[PDB]
Every structure is written in structure tokens, then in C-alpha cells.
Amino acid sequence: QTTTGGAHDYKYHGGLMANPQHHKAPGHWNMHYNKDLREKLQQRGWRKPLTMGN
Amino acid sequence: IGPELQSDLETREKLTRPIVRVFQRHPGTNLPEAQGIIRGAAGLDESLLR
Amino acid sequence: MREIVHMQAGQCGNQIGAKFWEVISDEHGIDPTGTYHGDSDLQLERINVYYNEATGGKYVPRAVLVDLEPGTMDSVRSGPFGQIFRPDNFVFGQSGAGNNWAKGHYTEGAELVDSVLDVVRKEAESCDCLQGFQLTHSLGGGTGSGMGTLLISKIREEYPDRIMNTFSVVPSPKVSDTVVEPYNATLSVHQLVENTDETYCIDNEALYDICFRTLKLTTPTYGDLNHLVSATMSGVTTCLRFPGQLNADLRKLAVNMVPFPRLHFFMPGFAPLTSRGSQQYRALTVPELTQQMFDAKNMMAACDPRHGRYLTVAAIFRGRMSMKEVDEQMLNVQNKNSSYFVEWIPNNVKTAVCDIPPRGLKMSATFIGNSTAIQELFKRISEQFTAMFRRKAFLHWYTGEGMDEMEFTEAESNMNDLVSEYQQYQDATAE
Amino acid sequence: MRECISIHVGQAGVQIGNACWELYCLEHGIQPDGQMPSDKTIGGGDDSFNTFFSETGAGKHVPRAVFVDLEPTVVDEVRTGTYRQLFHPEQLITGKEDAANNYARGHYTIGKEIVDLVLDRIRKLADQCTGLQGFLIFHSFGGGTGSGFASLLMERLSVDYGKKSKLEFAIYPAPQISTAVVEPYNTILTTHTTLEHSDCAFMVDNEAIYDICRRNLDIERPTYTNLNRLIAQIVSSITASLRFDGALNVDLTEFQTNLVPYPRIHFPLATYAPVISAEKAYHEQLSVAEITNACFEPANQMVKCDPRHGKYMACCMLYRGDVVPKDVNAAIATIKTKRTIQFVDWCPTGFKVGINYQPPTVVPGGDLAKVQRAVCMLSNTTAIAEAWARLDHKFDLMYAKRAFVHWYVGEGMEEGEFSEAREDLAALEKDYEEVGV
Amino acid sequence: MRECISIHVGQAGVQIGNACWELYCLEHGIQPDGQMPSDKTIGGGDDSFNTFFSETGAGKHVPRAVFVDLEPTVVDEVRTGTYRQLFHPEQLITGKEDAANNYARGHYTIGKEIVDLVLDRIRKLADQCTGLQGFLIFHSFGGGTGSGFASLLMERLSVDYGKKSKLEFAIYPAPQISTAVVEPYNTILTTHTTLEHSDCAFMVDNEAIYDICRRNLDIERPTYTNLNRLIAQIVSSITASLRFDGALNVDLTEFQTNLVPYPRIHFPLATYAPVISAEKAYHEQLSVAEITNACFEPANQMVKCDPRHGKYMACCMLYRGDVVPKDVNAAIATIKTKRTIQFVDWCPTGFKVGINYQPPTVVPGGDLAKVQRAVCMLSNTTAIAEAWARLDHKFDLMYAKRAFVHWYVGEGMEEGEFSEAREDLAALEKDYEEVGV
Amino acid sequence: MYKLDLPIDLKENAAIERRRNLELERQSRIFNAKVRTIGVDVQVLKEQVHDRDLQ
Amino acid sequence: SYQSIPRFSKLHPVIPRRYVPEWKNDMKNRELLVKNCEMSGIIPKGPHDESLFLDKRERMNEVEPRVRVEAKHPNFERYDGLRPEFHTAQSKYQSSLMFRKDNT
Ligand SMILES: Nc1nc2c(ncn2[C@@H]2O[C@H](COP(=O)(O)OP(=O)(O)OP(=O)(O)O)[C@@H](O)[C@H]2O)c(=O)[nH]1
Ligand SMILES: Nc1nc2c(ncn2[C@@H]2O[C@H](COP(=O)(O)OP(=O)(O)OP(=O)(O)O)[C@@H](O)[C@H]2O)c(=O)[nH]1
Numbered sequence A: 001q002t003t004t005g006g007a008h009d010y011k012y013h014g015g016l017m018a019n020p021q022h023h024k025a026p027g028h029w030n031m032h033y034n035k036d037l038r039e040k041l042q043q044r045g046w047r048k049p050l051t052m053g054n
Numbered sequence B: 001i002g003p004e005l006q007s008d009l010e011t012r013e014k015l016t017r018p019i020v021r022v023f024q025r026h027p028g029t030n031l032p033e034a035q036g037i038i039r040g041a042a043g044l045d046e047s048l049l050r
Numbered sequence C: 001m002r003e004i005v006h007m008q009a010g011q012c013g014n015q016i017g018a019k020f021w022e023v024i025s026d027e028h029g030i031d032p033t034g035t036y037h038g039d040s041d042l043q044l045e046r047i048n049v050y051y052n053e054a055t056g057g058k059y060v061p062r063a064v065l066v067d068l069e070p071g072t073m074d075s076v077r078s079g080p081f082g083q084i085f086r087p088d089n090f091v092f093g094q095s096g097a098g099n100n101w102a103k104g105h106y107t108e109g110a111e112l113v114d115s116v117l118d119v120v121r122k123e124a125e126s127c128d129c130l131q132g133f134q135l136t137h138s139l140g141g142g143t144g145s146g147m148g149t150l151l152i153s154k155i156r157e158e159y160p161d162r163i164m165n166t167f168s169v170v171p172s173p174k175v176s177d178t179v180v181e182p183y184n185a186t187l188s189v190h191q192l193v194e195n196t197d198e199t200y201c202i203d204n205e206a207l208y209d210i211c212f213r214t215l216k217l218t219t220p221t222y223g224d225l226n227h228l229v230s231a232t233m234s235g236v237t238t239c240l241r242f243p244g245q246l247n248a249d250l251r252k253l254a255v256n257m258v259p260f261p262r263l264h265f266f267m268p269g270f271a272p273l274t275s276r277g278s279q280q281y282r283a284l285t286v287p288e289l290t291q292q293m294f295d296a297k298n299m300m301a302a303c304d305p306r307h308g309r310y311l312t313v314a315a316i317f318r319g320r321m322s323m324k325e326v327d328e329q330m331l332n333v334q335n336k337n338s339s340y341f342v343e344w345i346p347n348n349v350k351t352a353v354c355d356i357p358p359r360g361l362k363m364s365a366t367f368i369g370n371s372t373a374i375q376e377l378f379k380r381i382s383e384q385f386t387a388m389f390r391r392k393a394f395l396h397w398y399t400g401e402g403m404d405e406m407e408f409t410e411a412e413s414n415m416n417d418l419v420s421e422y423q424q425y426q427d428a429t430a431e
Numbered sequence D, E: 001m002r003e004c005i006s007i008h009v010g011q012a013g014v015q016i017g018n019a020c021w022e023l024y025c026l027e028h029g030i031q032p033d034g035q036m037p038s039d040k041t042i043g044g045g046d047d048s049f050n051t052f053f054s055e056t057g058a059g060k061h062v063p064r065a066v067f068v069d070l071e072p073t074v075v076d077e078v079r080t081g082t083y084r085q086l087f088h089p090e091q092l093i094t095g096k097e098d099a100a101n102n103y104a105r106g107h108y109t110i111g112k113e114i115v116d117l118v119l120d121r122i123r124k125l126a127d128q129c130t131g132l133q134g135f136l137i138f139h140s141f142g143g144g145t146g147s148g149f150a151s152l153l154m155e156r157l158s159v160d161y162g163k164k165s166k167l168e169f170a171i172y173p174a175p176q177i178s179t180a181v182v183e184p185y186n187t188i189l190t191t192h193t194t195l196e197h198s199d200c201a202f203m204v205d206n207e208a209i210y211d212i213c214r215r216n217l218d219i220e221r222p223t224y225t226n227l228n229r230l231i232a233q234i235v236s237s238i239t240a241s242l243r244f245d246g247a248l249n250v251d252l253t254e255f256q257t258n259l260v261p262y263p264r265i266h267f268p269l270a271t272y273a274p275v276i277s278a279e280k281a282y283h284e285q286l287s288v289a290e291i292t293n294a295c296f297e298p299a300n301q302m303v304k305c306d307p308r309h310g311k312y313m314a315c316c317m318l319y320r321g322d323v324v325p326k327d328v329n330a331a332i333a334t335i336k337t338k339r340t341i342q343f344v345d346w347c348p349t350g351f352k353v354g355i356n357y358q359p360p361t362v363v364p365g366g367d368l369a370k371v372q373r374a375v376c377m378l379s380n381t382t383a384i385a386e387a388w389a390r391l392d393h394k395f396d397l398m399y400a401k402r403a404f405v406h407w408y409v410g411e412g413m414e415e416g417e418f419s420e421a422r423e424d425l426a427a428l429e430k431d432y433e434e435v436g437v
Numbered sequence F: 001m002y003k004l005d006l007p008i009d010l011k012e013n014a015a016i017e018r019r020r021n022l023e024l025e026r027q028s029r030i031f032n033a034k035v036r037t038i039g040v041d042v043q044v045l046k047e048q049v050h051d052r053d054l055q
Numbered sequence G: 001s002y003q004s005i006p007r008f009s010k011l012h013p014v015i016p017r018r019y020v021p022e023w024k025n026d027m028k029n030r031e032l033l034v035k036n037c038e039m040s041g042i043i044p045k046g047p048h049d050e051s052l053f054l055d056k057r058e059r060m061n062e063v064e065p066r067v068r069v070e071a072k073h074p075n076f077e078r079y080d081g082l083r084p085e086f087h088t089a090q091s092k093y094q095s096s097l098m099f100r101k102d103n104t
């Protein structure tokens, strides 16, 4: 039996002996909030397509 | 020297006690008490090293 | 991957080194055939430091067996663990040594030295990164002394950067076992001083006292003595072969023990040694292991450390143990025996910890002591030298096969200079 | 974006690396295979592993570490032990023969065969970052690889890499406990590199960690493993501002600008609170005041010198857990109303506070109790001169007789090294004294 | 905002502390593992235990006490007793070598490696507090830990805490009953150095409590447990105004200012009434006036000294239970009118009355009955000059031939300390006599 | 690679409101000062005690 | 313009952090406060260096000369302090003062 081999065994992350990982933040250049834009653009359904006929 | 917390000065022995605040409400002042305890601490330190 | 080339000269060397090879063989799991039959992969990982891949799972020692006369080498071959050796590593003449230094060194050792250099060159150039050489012999005979010193000199000339360990069992205080051993020991140590990196002086009287007092052992025989010497060899090279918390190889030990190039004669020792019927009365702790290490009766050198000062100490522990306990024990023994250590070097202790103890043991320990008490041994050899050099007894031989008296004078002057230095760094103070 | 490169050199450094990366894997949830089970991240801040683990392929996270030891035993044990697939094989660099406690062997003869490869691997590790915060360089003052090769390594890094942080975690010889004889020689020799090439050197003492584990952890027989784990706790609490959000985040640049007043006073002391066991965690309060007074505790520093005889210069508090400035300011006021703490004259404002959200992560099978509040104190006190004084005395009474000098001389090293390192140590002593007065 | 740190030093300190905190746990409903259970009106809003027990997140109510003794087996009896896991592990400080009934050994040689650690524990117990009101220190003047280490400890507490109220509970040696032979030395040499480091010093006597238990309690074969139970009751009666509200109440400072006339006359005797058993008290009309008289017989005090030979100076009465203050005032009027009690002419209003609603708490195994009314008298009178005279006579007799002095010289003392302690007690005798006239 | 569209926006919003859930967790922990200052968890402490005793 | 270069006394753990005297910043009746510092001529009235105590030290700078600071002695000698009277609080120190003998 080696000292470091017996000490550093397979350690299982998570479980009862763990805290939830508090991530810092996503990037503001990555964060676009387009879901709200989709649900806004769903409204006003009487639009006409921007084509030459209209 | 006193205790290791000047939140625990036992207001009687304080250099900002109400008596000396009444003192320093007027100009002049600058009592020779803090310098006296400076000299006493210095003398006791030299005695300790000797 | 470092390698050690082991050379054994003389009948004493060919017995002790064969026992050493057998001990490390059944420590690494090598069977008498030569194949690996261990259980762990640690025995197989660092195996090239002493062995060579011969046939699949077969490992052969890197031994070089040297003798002027095929004496104990034949018995080593015909004994157990004797066919693991490569058959052409046995280099042998047919004349005798006669316990004569010049026969071993100048006249009859001249015809075998080229063959031994060829064999050890073939062994050494096969290693990718050779570390050093380990010679086992006696400073009392002709083959162990003469051919041994010649081999050390030639190996130093060809490889002047490798670590040279010599064990070289030395003459006893009481009982001689050879009547010309003052001449032999003086002429051998005259070249062991200026050639070897380090030497582990062993006294048979100290071995007998170890067997009698710390091991009972009403019938010791030379097997137990060579076993103890083999245990010390395994203890001083275990950090190459097994991983540990704090490693220390041969070069590290040489750096950490010798303060000056002249002083490299050590006192080996092994712990724990228990009298048969006392293991139930003793309890295994690091403090008792260290106290048995630093006990004066435990070393294999007959000179007493109480008649001297410890220049340096190397403590190589083997076993699952605490570095805090090891360092605290070294600090405790150094502080309590404050008069047995030189004042101008603080912490005269180099520690090492190996994680693999010998089989059947929980903890083992190897003590290497560079002390100023070696001057007792050298003064004894110098006194028994100058007792007969003034009357020229047993010297017509050495004159007959052809050295001059100036060589004997230079050897005794070199011994006296070494005694003077060991006496100087015992009474020299810091400030 | 907030990457940091760890360089573990020496056997001691490789053991710090083992403990540090097992703790980092437990913190960020990378298995020893190298996979994250739950990874719902976009990039740019939410990838808290990115300061330590890079990215490759189908979800493999290789560490940003370089392991160096001339002796191929401990790194080979790492290569054949548990964290086998985690590390890239070329990061684990070995030699053939060690320097064997010899600064001359580590710096002048054996050293210039592997240093070029180490610099190439460091360059390859640094070229893949998107902005580098610094180097965490873990090594020893005991000697050999940790002194000579490490000295050459900081010399080369300070020549070429220039304006990057070079935080050097060095373990220091104890006042009385030692494992070598040429250790004072090596320790005095590796002073110029930490003065002229390091940006912040954390000297930590093995006997002090032994006393801490004996007194607070109830470990009667501590080994190197607990010491390695607690040093990993310290460096994780240092770096956690780069990985998890907090009320006040302190990066390495703010950290250095708040510690060091002069470029030669980059020797702070590191202490960690609490370092208790769980049976004491039952009967202890573990509030912010308690774990700050434990940081200012005399017998809780990690070198053997009490700061009662010294003067505090700049204390960087790194609070870690459920910690609020409502408690932090009360703790700071309680400290500043204490006589025993003696701040230096020219620093009225001497506290740099950084509060993090993520509580410390406990290793499953260690010694420290899992707590929701901790302080990593990094204080630049001037009481560190005691360590220089003890090694000064040891080097004086060793070098007075010129013992163990022929090794260094014959291994390609002029004997003026000892005198110049001696003068540099005396310069540091005098500088710290005139700063303290 | 109100707290009292308890320091039990010596074996006599530790056993009194065991009985005291058995009483405290029973008064506050603290189970022997240290947890308030749940509910029933006051739940999560109780502060009767704030002076004595802190709070933790495990529910453990950590004691605000330090049990220190230079000898083992008594702290070990605490650590293997019923209150094994009530106490904090580091709050139970023990040494290795016994102090050997020696003031010099406890003060100068063996007690110097324990005083720093016990001051560290007192610092932790004090910085766990925001409204600290005093240090209640329990020991005996028999010798060793209770004499030398206690004196050194109170000197260090005076240095480190200012002149905070350091209340003293001292087991004074009996006239006829004795345990040691070096008791006069150990008592004179500690009276000299603790005459000016304790603000108030309640003397108590084992022979007097033996007589009390034999006569008024029918416990014909008593042990130390009964004595410690009465001492626990008479300390809890003092402290109960800090934990239970009611009528006229008195803290640790008000009764000091109303008790000590001069700063060197700070040695009062103590009395508790009604010391009584169940079958004895069942035939009784236990009332305020007659329990005041019960405090006032000369054969009812806890010090073997007749108060009829002296004159009362200041009496602080502490009534507990359903006590109407008109009965207290009537009792004061009757004891003032009757001429068997003599008062000094410079104290017309010689009484300070504090009334608390909480009745005393009995223990399952004790000897005191559950009563409605109780009173604790702290009397500063000049009748302690007889005790000082007996101690002085024994000290002079055993010091005339220098018997038992080579031990003190070997473990670090002079004849100068003995001589200055002798003339210090002579000055104290003179001061008591001139105050009495 | 992939196109950046409505599933990517949904993943982004899930990340936002996960961050919200984590910070309300922290708010519930810190605005409850009996948990914030005198906290630490009995179950994990007991498991660690049993681990030490077993070791 | 002029040069100040503020200086301070040596350290003591009784000085309570920052403390300015009241009269320097006593603005209910200031209009005749400053002329008391003008007629004397020894007390500077400037806006700067108001902290009589800054960190833990006394200000040796332009707040009064050093004379008239130490001149408020009520004529207390070592003869009085080494034999204190009984009814004062200074008799709490008697056993540490009786070891001091009496010479000066
Ligand atoms: N705290 C701690 N210290 C260690 C550990 N391993 C080794 N050391 C220290 O390392 C010092 C010995 O020198 P090393 O660092 O091993 O030398 P090296 O860097 O391996 O270089 P070489 O001497 O050539 O082998 C001792 O003083 C130990 O304190 C460890 O796991 N933890
Ligand atoms: N009332 C009471 N008195 C006690 C008790 N235990 C010891 N004593 C007193 O203590 C005296 C004996 O000296 P100790 O106080 O035990 O001495 P120590 O504090 O143990 O210090 P060392 O003798 O050095 O170990 C006796 O005269 C007793 O009156 C107790 O439990 N109750």
C-alpha cells in the first residue's frame, strides 16, 4: 500500500457532502433575451409580409 | 498599558472620558496624561530589557 | 530509470553479495528459476535497478562475481538461488590470492582485470542511465582487498561521475581471521580513501554482538550475518525501487552525509531486531524504532559512538508511518543526545521514507552513521600496522612480488591523516 | 477568460498538485475520467472550471498544470494512479536522475536539459488561454528540483513572460524540524529568485501545519496528506474569486496592489480558518468574528513566528461562504480595537476585503469539517524576519567551516553564490526592519 | 448583554463547577447533552441561559466556563462523567504534573506552560460575549493549582481585561479541620497577591458547611457533593438576578458598590437560608423574617468565625421566591432594633436588598427541600480578623523554623515573598482593626 | 455546428432563471441570520464523525 | 503658502482611534471662539490638523506648543503615590508600591 495511493482514492463529487455550485454569470455579449422577443413577435397576427405586393 | 480591547476601557480611565470632553469643549487643553503614560511605558520597557 | 551495477569480489564478497541478491530476489518476487512470481505491480515497476529482462518474465541480476580462484563462487552456483546469475558474469582465474594484497592487485590480479572491465563495461553500457556501482568485499584478504581496490580505481577512471558504494567488511578489534590483515586493510583503505564515494564499514564482532544480545541466536552462522548486511543494502537502496513519501537515492545520501570528500566511512545499522521471545513484550512504535536505531549496540561497526561525535546520520524508514512522528523522533533524539552531535551542523539527520516495508514486517529502519568514532578503527589498524612494520614481518612477501616500502609508508601516512581529520572535526567548535 | 496556470515542481510540488487537483475536481464536478455529468453552460463566466480546466472534444476537461520532477518516481506514481486519464501525458514531465538536494545540480548541470521542454509545454499551455491571470508555482526550499530547477524556471519566466503574475507557493524549512542537511544551503540559495522573479511568495512551514493539525484537527499522527489537503484548501480559497461570484470579488491584480507597498516586501503569511474537526464543529459557533480572530490567532499562523513581535502591514481577507459585510465590518472593527494586533504607522486603512458566495468544498474522507463560512487571510506582516534569522544563523554556523561546499563547487557553481545570497538575505532582513520601525 | 465567565481552577474548583452546572442545567432545562428541547410557550425566545450557555448550530448549548487543573483524573472524571458531551473539548484544560500542594510550583514552574493556553480560552469565551459582566472564579486556598495558578491567572486577567469584576469564591482553610500542612504558606502567599486582583472575595469554610449539614440538614455522614451543592445554590442565588426578572434586582456591580467600603476590605462571608431538608421543613412556617434571622445566627454561616465578636459593615441580602418586600423591610427593622447584632457607626443604612421572583431549583439527589422563600446574605464584617489571626499564628509558628520552605525555594521562591506576605497580612489586620474602632 | 434559434434562446432563458433560483436559495440562507451566522449542518457533521471513527 | 509635515508621538493602545477636540468644531458659539485663539497667539486656528489623535498617536504638530501642555501639573510626587491613603482607589495598588522603596 502506497501513502498517496491510499490517500487519493476515487472521490465522488456531489451528494450530501456538497453544496450547489454557484456559477458566476453568463456573458452579457452571450445573453440576448430573445425568448421575450419571440413571445412579443407572436402577437399582432394581422401583419402582412414585407414583400413587393404589399 | 491596559486591556487588549479599548472597547473595554471602563469609561473612568479613558482619554475621551466626559470630564476631558468638558475640558476640550474650550480651547487650550492638551493634558499631560497620554504623554505621561508614554514615558511610563517607555521606562518600564527599558527596565524589562535590562 | 536508474541502474546499479553490483560487483562482488573475494570469497566474503561472493557470499555476502549472493545473500544480498537472494534477499532482494525474494523481496521483489523473483523465483529461483528467475521469473516474476509476486503479487503487486510495485515489485515489477522498478525492477531494472538490479535486474535485466532476460526471457519474457525472467529477470537476471546485474551481478559481476570476481575471484582469483573459483572457491565460494562454485558453492554459490550450486546453492539455492544460484542459477539466476548470468553464466558468463563469473570471472575467475586459477591461481590463489593467499590473503596477499599484491597478489590480488599487481601480479595475479593483472590477468583478470581486463576481463572484469570487459564484463562490467558490457553491463554498464546496456543501462540507459547508469547511477553507480556497489562493491562487496573484505579489507582483510587478497581478492577482496587487492582486486577490489584495483577495480574501484579502474571503474573510477572510466566513469568519474557515478556513485561508488563499497561495503568492505573491515578487520575486527578482537580475533584476526587473517594474520596479515593490518597490511591488507592499510593498503586497501589507502585507495578506498581517494576513490570511493562512500563506504559502509562493518565489523564481525559487532555482528556477533548483534546476534548474541539483540537476537539470542545460539547458532548464528554466517548466513544471518550476510542476511543483516543484505538488509542494510536493501534499506539503503529501497528509495530507488519503491515509491515513498520522501525519497532519497545514493547520490542524495552521499550529498547529505559527507561534509568533506575524505570523510565517507559510515556505520550501518538495521532496526527492528528482536530477541526470539520478546515481540509480545515490545510494541511497535516509531519512537522505539528510532531508539533502537540510535542505540549503540545496534550498528554493525564495533567502534562506539559515545567515544566520538556524529557528523551526520541518515535514517531510511520503510513502512506506513507519519512524517510528523518521524521528524519529531529525529528532533527528540538529536535534542536529548546533544553531546553526540557536532555543534557546527544543525540537523545532522537526512530522513527518507519508503512505503514498502520488508515482508513479514510493519516497519523497518536503516541507520547510516558518519561519526568521528571511525578513528578508533583506523587507529587500531594503524597500531597493528606499525607494530609489525618496524620489524618488517610478513613483508618479504610483498617485496617479493614487487612493491616498495614507500607505498606502505604512504598508506600509513594517509591513514594517519584521516585519523587527524576525524579528530579535528570532533573537537572543532563553531565559535 | 480568467485562466491560471499551475506549475508543480519537485516531489513536494507534485504532491501539492495531487491534492490541489483532486480538490479542484471535487469542487467543479469533473470525474477523474475527465467528464462533467451536468454541464449547462454557455461560456464567458459560467464556466467556472475554465480557470483550471480547458476544453477538448466530446466533453473532456484537461487541467492547466505542468508537473516537473527530475526523479521519475512520484510523477510516475501520478501517471499510474487514479488521476491517470485526467492529465495530458506531455504535461507530466520527468527526467532520469534527480538533483539529489543540490542547487548546483538542479541549476547548472542537470537543469539545462529539461527546462527547454518545460518552457515549450508552458508556452503550449498558455497559448490556448483567452487571457491569463497568473502562474501558481508550487515548490520547496528543501533543495534539488524545488530549488535549482525552480530557480531557473522563475528566471526564464520573468525574462520572457514579462507582465504576468507569478504567485509562488513555497514550503519553508522549520526552525527545528528538517529532513536534510544541505537544506540551509539550498534555502539561502533560493532567495534571490523569490526576491527578483516572484511577484508574491507564500512561505509555509511544515512544523506549523503539524501544530495546526495536532491542535485543531485532533490528528495525533499527521502525514503529508493532511498538509497537502489544507494547502489545497488555501489556494482554492485564494482562486475562488476567479471562479464563483461574490459580493466583493478580488482578482490577483487587486490582491497584489493591496498587499505589497514596495516591490521587495512580497512575503505574506497565509492562514485559513476554521481548520477544525467535526466533533469541535459541534461545540463551536463558527461565526465571522470567530473565524477572523482565528486568522489573527498567534498559534494559528503557518510559519513559526508570532506576529506579536511584529507589525501588520496589509491584510487581505478572503471570506468564503454565507458571509455578509454586516458581519465583515463588525469583525474588522473588533480587530482594529484590539491591542495585540499592531498595525504599521503608515497604513491606517490596512484591510482589503473580498467576499465570495460559494462555501468551501469538503473532500470525502479528509479531516476538515464542512463549514459554510471561512476566511483565507493573506497578511503581509513584518514578523517573517524570524525565519530569515533562523536560516541566517544556520547558514552562518554551517558555512563557517565550509562543510558541504565541494559538491556545489564541483557541480559547476562558483563559491560566491553563498556570499551573494547571504548578502541578499541580510538586505531583506534590514529592509523589513526599517519598514517595521 | 449580560454574561459571566466561570473559571473553575483546582480540584476544589472543578467539583464545585460540576455541581454548579448541574444546578444551572436543571434551572434552565438544559439536558446533559446540552439541548433545549422544543416548545411550550417560551420556544426560540428564551434568554435565561444567556449568562451561562452560548448557542451553536448543532443545538449544543456550550458552557461559558473553563475547568482548569494542573493534575489529571478530575478533568478526566468530568470528561467521562454524565456531562461528557455538554462541555466543549478545549474548555477542559489539564496538565501533566501535579502542583504538589506548592504555591511556588503552581505559580512559577509548572503553571507557566498552561497560563497562555487558558488565557487563550478565556479570550475566546470573552469575544463570544458582547455584554460581559464578570469572571466568577472558584478555588480553594489549600494549595497548588487553587493557590499558585489561580493567583497567576487572576494577575494575568487583571492585566488583560482591565479591572472587570473578578468575583472570587475561595474555600478558606478551617481552624481545626485541615487537609494539607503547607496550607498556611499556600494561603498567606495567595492572600498577598490576590488581595488586590479580586474585587470581591467570598470566603467559605468546609468545617462550617460540615456543621451546617450535620445540624440543620440531618446528613450526619456528608461528603464534598453536599458542600458543592450548597455552594452552587449560594452562587446561583447571586447570579439569578441576571437571568430572572422581578422586584428590586442587583447586578454584579451594584452589590459590589454597596458591599465593599474600602478597596482592600473586600473579603465578605456568605450565608444561605433556609438550609433545610424535606421532613424537617414540613413542620415549619418558612417566612421572610425568620429566614433573615436564619441568616443571622452565629451558628449558621459558611465561615467558622463568630460575628458577635465583630461588627457588621455592609450586608447584601438576596431574596428569592414569592417574597413581598414589606416582610423584608420588617425583618430589616427587627434585626436593626435587636441589640445582639452590632453595626459600625459609619454605616446607618447597612443593607442592600435584591428581590427576585424565581424560587430555587432542587436536584434529584440533593438535600435541600423545595421551598417558597430563600435568602442569600453576603456580609462584609470585621469578624474575619479572627480568621486572619489564626492563619497568621500558624504561618508564624511554621515559618519560625523555616519548615517546608526548601520546596518553595526549589520551585522558585525566596524568603522575601514570605516576609512581604506576612507584613501585608499584618497591614490588613491593622486596617481591619482601625476600621472596626 | 448548429443554427442559433429558439432552442438556443430557451437554453439561455433556462440559464437565467437557474441563476435566479440559486440567488433566491442564497437569499433564503442569508436573510435567516440564525442560519447565516450560527449555521453548519448536523447530518454532514455526523457522517464525517462516523468516517473519522471508522478510519 | 507654507509647509506643515505632520508628526506624531509613539504608539500606545489607550488612544481611541480618531478624536478631535470639541472646541475646534464647536459651532454653536464659534464667532468668539476663534478670537480666544487669536489674542493668545500660541494656538493655531487653521482648518488643518484638527485630529489631536489620528490613529493611536498624539499630535505633536501645530496644536499648542509643547510647553503649557506638560505645565498642568497638580504637583504630585513619588512620595504621595508610594504611600496612598486608604479611602481612595489608589490603595488598590499597595502591595506593588510597597516593593518600590522610596528614594526619589
Ligand atoms: N508539506 C509537504 N512537504 C513535502 C511533501 N513532500 C516533500 N516535502 C518537503 O520536501 C522537502 C525535501 O525536499 P524535496 O522537495 O523533496 O526535494 P525535490 O524538490 O524533490 O528535489 P530533490 O532534492 O532533487 O529530490 C522536505 O523538507 C519536505 O518538507 C509533502 O507532501 N507535503
Ligand atoms: N467544599 C469542597 N472543598 C473541596 C472540594 N475538593 C477539595 N476541596 C478543598 O480543597 C482542599 C485540598 O486542596 P485542593 O484544593 O484539592 O488542591 P488542588 O486545587 O487540587 O491543587 P493541588 O493540591 O496542587 O492538586 C481541602 O482542604 C478541601 O477543603 C470539594 O469538592 N468541595
Ligand SMILES: Nc1nc2c(ncn2[C@@H]2O[C@H](COP(=O)(O)OP(=O)(O)O)[C@@H](O)[C@H]2O)c(=O)[nH]1
Pocket: C009, C010, C011, C012, C013, C015, C016, C097, C098, C099, C138, C140, C141, C142, C143, C144, C145, C169, C171, C176, C177, C178, C204, C222, C225, C226
Ligand atoms: N560477514 C561475513 N564475513 C566473512 C564471510 N566470509 C569471510 N568473511 C570475512 O572475510 C575475512 C577474510 O577475507 P577473505 O574474504 O577470505 O579475503 P579473500 O581470500 O581475498 O577472498 C575474514 O576476516 C572474515 O571475517 C561471510 O560469509 N560473512
Ligand SMILES: [Mg+2]
Pocket: C247, D010, D011, D069, D071, D098, D144, D145
Ligand atoms: Mg525528489
Ligand SMILES: [Mg+2]
Pocket: E010, E011, E071, E145
Ligand atoms: Mg489536585
